[PDB]
Symmetry: D2
Subunit: 489 residues, 4 copies
Amino acid sequence: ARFEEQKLYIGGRYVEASSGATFETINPANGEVLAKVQRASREDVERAVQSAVEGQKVWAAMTAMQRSRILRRAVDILRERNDELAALETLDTGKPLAETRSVDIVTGADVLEYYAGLVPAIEGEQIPLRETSFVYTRREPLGVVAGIGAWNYPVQIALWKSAPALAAGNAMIFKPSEVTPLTALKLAEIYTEAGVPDGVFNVLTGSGREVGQWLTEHPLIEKISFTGGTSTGKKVMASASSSSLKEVTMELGGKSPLIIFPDADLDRAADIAVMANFFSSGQVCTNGTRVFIHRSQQARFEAKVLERVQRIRLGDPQDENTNFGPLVSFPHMESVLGYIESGKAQKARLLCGGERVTDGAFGKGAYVAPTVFTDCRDDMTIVREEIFGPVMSILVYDDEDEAIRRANDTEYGLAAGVVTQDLARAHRAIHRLEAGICWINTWGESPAEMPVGGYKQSGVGRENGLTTLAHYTRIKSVQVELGDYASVF
Amino acid sequence: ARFEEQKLYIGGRYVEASSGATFETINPANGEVLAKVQRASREDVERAVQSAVEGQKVWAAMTAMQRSRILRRAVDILRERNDELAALETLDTGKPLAETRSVDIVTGADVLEYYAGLVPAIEGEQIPLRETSFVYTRREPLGVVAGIGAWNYPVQIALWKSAPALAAGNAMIFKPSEVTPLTALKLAEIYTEAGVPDGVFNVLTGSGREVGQWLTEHPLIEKISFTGGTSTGKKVMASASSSSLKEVTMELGGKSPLIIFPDADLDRAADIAVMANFFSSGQVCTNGTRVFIHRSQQARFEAKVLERVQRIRLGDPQDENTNFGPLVSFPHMESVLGYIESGKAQKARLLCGGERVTDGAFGKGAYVAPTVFTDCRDDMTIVREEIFGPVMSILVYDDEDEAIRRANDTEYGLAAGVVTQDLARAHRAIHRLEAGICWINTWGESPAEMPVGGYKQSGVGRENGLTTLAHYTRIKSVQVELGDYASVF
Amino acid sequence: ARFEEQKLYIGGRYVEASSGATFETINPANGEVLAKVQRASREDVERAVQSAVEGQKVWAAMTAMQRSRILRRAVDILRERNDELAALETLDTGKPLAETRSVDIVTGADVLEYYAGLVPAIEGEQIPLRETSFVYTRREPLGVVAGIGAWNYPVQIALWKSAPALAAGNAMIFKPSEVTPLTALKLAEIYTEAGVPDGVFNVLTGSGREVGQWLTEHPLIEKISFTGGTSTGKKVMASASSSSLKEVTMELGGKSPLIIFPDADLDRAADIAVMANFFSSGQVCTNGTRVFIHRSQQARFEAKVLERVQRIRLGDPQDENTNFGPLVSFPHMESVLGYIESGKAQKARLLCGGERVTDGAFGKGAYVAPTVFTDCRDDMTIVREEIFGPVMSILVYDDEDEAIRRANDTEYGLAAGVVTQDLARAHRAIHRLEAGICWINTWGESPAEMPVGGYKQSGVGRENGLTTLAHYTRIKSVQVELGDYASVF
Amino acid sequence: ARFEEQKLYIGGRYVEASSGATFETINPANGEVLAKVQRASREDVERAVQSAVEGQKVWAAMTAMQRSRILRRAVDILRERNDELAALETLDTGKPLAETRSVDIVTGADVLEYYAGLVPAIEGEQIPLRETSFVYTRREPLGVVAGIGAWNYPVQIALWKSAPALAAGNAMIFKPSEVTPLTALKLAEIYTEAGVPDGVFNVLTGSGREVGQWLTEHPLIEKISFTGGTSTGKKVMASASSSSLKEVTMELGGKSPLIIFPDADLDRAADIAVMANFFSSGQVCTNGTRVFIHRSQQARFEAKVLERVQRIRLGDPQDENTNFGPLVSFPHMESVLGYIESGKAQKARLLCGGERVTDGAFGKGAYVAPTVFTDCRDDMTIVREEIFGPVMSILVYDDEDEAIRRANDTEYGLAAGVVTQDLARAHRAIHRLEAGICWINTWGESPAEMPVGGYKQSGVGRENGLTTLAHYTRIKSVQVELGDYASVF
Ligand SMILES: [K+]
Ligand SMILES: [K+]
Ligand SMILES: [K+]
Ligand SMILES: [K+]
Ligand SMILES: [K+]
Ligand SMILES: [K+]
Ligand SMILES: [K+]
Ligand SMILES: [K+]
Ligand SMILES: [K+]
Ligand SMILES: [K+]
Ligand SMILES: [K+]
Ligand SMILES: [K+]
């Protein structure tokens, strides 16, 4: 293995698991074993819960500004170790260094930095009732919460969940994806160095069916935040509900539509469509995988997509010049290739790509070529289902109302976007699109201030923005009676 | 039957169900059959959903002030028909006319009135990112939502759920308890009379395991709001989750503590304790069923409680002089008597009542005497478990920290309260009590402005207050890019 | 006269002034004496203040919903009396019935309705400091406030000031313009009929130099809200400050620019330009009196403006078909004609109008033709100074940056607007314009929800929207210390 | 002189004034000339304005987080240089090192730190009107603003004014008191070193009647924030209004009441009263200079006050053991002694002090002993007027309503406090006190989160808290019309 054995992080240090079992994390670019990683047992979950209960008390007893300063110190460390953490994320995920060095830690720390400054701004309400009575609310910490991460942006997701949870005075137990456990453990080390109390951010490694479920079932955990697939999310939310009625945030899957209107800058439109499909090798939840183009512009648009796709630099993600890496794992590659074969079988027209890249060293990795299908139909499997790989589906439409109806005809509702130069059309279309994250003349930017999450089966709750901080607190209403009390008895 | 057969309410009128099945609603005061009530079929659920989808479009298309005026008109009608509706609620629930004429419709309409005024104040945010880009958010309706009511405050709970739903621009399908279906239908008529579009408030009658379940499973319903038992709430929330990842509000059970500190005026304390236990014959979710009294004041406190409980006027709820009616049903009375016998068996000292009242006409109704146990212990079944009847448990303590520790030692967290004249003690204690609804020197008041709901296994989300209106909307973030777009490809 | 003598309104009824002085209000269409009106003495101001102090206590002692219901009742009465008040406003101001029946009371009551619904939403904050201390704020009424009205929209201005004042729990003494006293007295009757307590809205008639000044100087008045000219506003605000440091709102003059970009539909641009200059005969503070047109569009634009100006229906404001009435007075007309003559003297090109209309019965009124100058230059008097009459100045520009710079080159900053179909240009340009009220592809609409007021010398503070209700309260911060107190002594 | 000639700070560096004139700043402990300081000319004011205009554009063009990080860097430097700055403040003000090292920079920096984290939280609103139109607001910087500081807390006031002004994207020109000009110049160096762009914080030294007036009259400055006496504030606010209608914040004088209720612990009451009168040698605007005690507890309270006053450690402010220093200046000392003599002449009973201290080296300084008058009456000059020195007035009352009425009977309204252990009375009494800053069972703490400012003639607007940041922005409302535009012409 490249690295030493990775252990559980509980109480400000690494501790041995008690399962007697490990799993391997693999580098998807070459099949190299990166590390053996311990599996947390049911007793380890209990241990992390008790540690979080005690640690949360220390954390909540500090002043708001003391918490703020500690989180700001964590941000400073993250900025300092940006390139080091980026190199690790690239090993674990296969995403290009060009991406990890500029996105993953940058934007994860951006959100932690944002919430760090807001700790003193967490306030309740005061409501007078009459001269002799008034109400005030408190926004108290939930206590111990759990985060369950996904494998596409491991440390970014860890930061986006832990930052508001910790800013709101909670302790979080975090379970990274079995596929990508490494950077989450580094984050825990950084929080401790920054001054976060022992127990406040603990990390348990292992599978979802076990460790994830033990967390979602635990009676002392007050909230679960999960990022991953919709089918899995339903199961997680159900377990969280039936066990102890936990509060939930779910950031799930999508089949987001990008509508290119006839008055769009077509070069901007093609830049947007390729960014919305092939960044992180197509493994982004918000990807615009159904691209709607007017019939009159189909040929011109295909030419523009083809030109951009042909110059994608697929390669070793450790090369600075690479902008397109392998997929995260060999099993994920198999799944994506299955969807590609489905697309061919249902007679979608293959424009670009469509197979595994095996030339030379690439045969050692999980590389799928950027793939574009056109002449697509709404009932096709590649159009209806999330592939979570580099596969764009181009759909022809004839009128604006039709495009919007078709865009909305899905159980998903994560993101949506339009490309048009018209003031009226831009806002009117976007207001009609049923998605939580809406982009006009752009795609993919997710500022710390902007709440993001899904409509419909794409999610519950939100992340980022002021609203998310409020949602990691629970409301206590206090009525103060200053006058008489009348009983009817 | 006292009244004609009750039909479903869909699309601004009554329609025939398609189940070919009915159930009865019984007057718990005298066992009389009040009405046959139709059971909705799965197809009737589909019918109600399609009606709601279309009606919601009409409703949302109006201006905010147009919706507000219509809701304010519904309020005016509710005030005008307060006594008539109260008469009906008393028949269906057995609650005293002195309660139904003063509380049920009064406080239900108060919440509708509150939200009616806030329709034009529902706003999103705007955030500048840079000269060339900004974000704005929209708070959009969820669309079609479903409310599932409880039997203790039928029309009030219908109003507390439907008011913020409609004010936020949604359509609601409401399922009242099988035990108490009558007033929800009247509310539906009133909304139509007020100018609410057909389909915006539909009412389906039937069972929780049938009609309730079909609503929680329906993929076009975006949110479920349920009030009822904690064990039932878990199944409901899990169903809502597993099916289509619906947003959820849960207002569930409690075993709420009332702590009487030694400096308290015992007359006020006794008044609060009695009000917190025997109002609506103890059928109130927020009731202060665990009463903590200091060892030095147990005797004096018990005397003041007995004094008050003795003059409780149990009787015909049709009598204005009555302040304590029968329970809502015979099976519930059976449940309550079961707990009372458990109290006796487990060595709790019986101070008041503890028997079914069967003299004269009371034998034909479901009357349980106001019951007080004392010398209780935390391990007793009557202390640990929600009874949802007129059974007060008095517990002795020795010091403040012990009292608060014991108050918090439950899986519940709905309400909590303290009685003390000391400024420091009042706020300090209340801040440590783990409940969503906290009262100082009072009990039971639930102003429209005050968000109410449970900590822990007592709930998810809140009702009333500004925050609840917010939670019947979904956030859409719109990023407007005014400048160039850079692609890495 | 047309009506009987109008007296002061103090304490829920009309009372005799103690000045022994009266003035006449005249119908500007025909010179008819409408009424003798009493002038408040210094003694009467004192009487109004004492009445307001006592009334404010009664009003503030009610619950929020009680105040809401009373303000909602006043709205109902205003809707009922809409046509009658419009008729009165038309007599007093000379504005066409077509305008007063659809704008003045409608939009005035719209704001009162808005704030009526918001009364229960006025809340303070709660901020925890540590375990042993927390802060809550109260948003308390200021107490007695004064509003000083303008003559162009008499009752709408009375409503826009009094509505948030009363909603926030204050009493207001209102001084309508000496030119237009009639509708303010009717509003006072209406508030009383709706249930507003005696003293909460008192009306004193008379001059700005006497009565207005005595209110602005009075030490028991806590806030002054003034609408009128910038020159006068400076003096009012200075007097409010030097007397007793009152809070202030000032809605003043403007020379607002309208920029028509070359991609604008010119029919729409001309419609906007004409509406922004000739509604209420050009007597609107927010009018777009500097109209910027690109050189390439100048000729076509002038032709389209000319077409519309030619079919403007000047005439008797009593005739429902009139859409352009006389000015408010002969001295005001003389001022406007002076500006028109300056325009001619300074070589601006006269496109339309430019003189008094005297034909037949029009000689008995103060009628000025809708006037358009073109080929204007930035240093012309008509371009630099507010005319407050029906005079449009059209200015040619060559590039976007130039237009925006010239638009901003004024001491005024009330409104600004752009007409363009381009998404990026619409927002980019508007973000750069230095005005409080900005319109894209429209002009003149002022929703109750939308805060309005001036940048620079056009205003201090805002009217309408949530923010304005807040500014009719004063913040009290309350720190509750629950723990020990440490002294250095 | 102890130090070199002090210059103006404009554009990120020191520059020579163009007046040809200087003034001296004197150490009040010993009369030593600390430095000659340049007087700014009218042309220097113009230079600072032009510098601020350009600097503000650079500052506002950064992202919110870029501004946040720079202000956070300034906080870090202030923390590093706390003791250094404290020592200079002690020289310039005479305040004890024990105070300046623990309060002045600590709490000034606390507010800068608070606002630094809030920069990304400044948001506008979004309001839908109908399908075809919506409004968004922007909170834009005012531009260039000016702050005029007072002499009692020179660097803290410079920070409390500049922090929200800079955080909101403005440049500020700051004019410290002529009495204490030294630390404001150091703050300017620190902002520059932290990365604040040249011109964003400029410092001009000189008199109030000259430099202060030239700033208040300048047409390019959009807001004035002034801290000082009420009499002076009226003139400053009037000049700001009459010149160009500037926005204003005024933090002015007080005669704040402290009410000690008869259930209060007299030791705690005495600690509060002494802290509320003698901290910073009585030179605090919010001081509780009118102390109300129940008639029956006057004797006992006087003895506890006398006990603590006798042990107050008056001395050299450079001695760490000193907790009470000389007054800020010899002319201020003379004013204070004049008030003391008025107290004697009006036959208030002198309990402690009441003389200048001249023993030994104290004779070279401006030392006035801690002074306590009792048997005071409401019509005495010392009770009516702000002394701004170490002079406590003790007043006997008989009932709560009387105490409150008397507490409120003043033109001032800055602060107020009550001492009581009773829950009801604490909140009831504090709700009735007409002051913006209210303390329960404490005095003097002013957390960054807590808005502070005066009712009545003690202020306009607020400092600190979320609300203050909002008041360093101006609201722009943008209405976007997406549909048709209708003209009446
Ligand atoms: K891996
Ligand atoms: K980017
Ligand atoms: K959902
Ligand atoms: K029943
Ligand atoms: K009640
Ligand atoms: K819960
Ligand atoms: K008139
Ligand atoms: K209109
Ligand atoms: K201004
Ligand atoms: K000095
Ligand atoms: K302190
Ligand atoms: K004031």
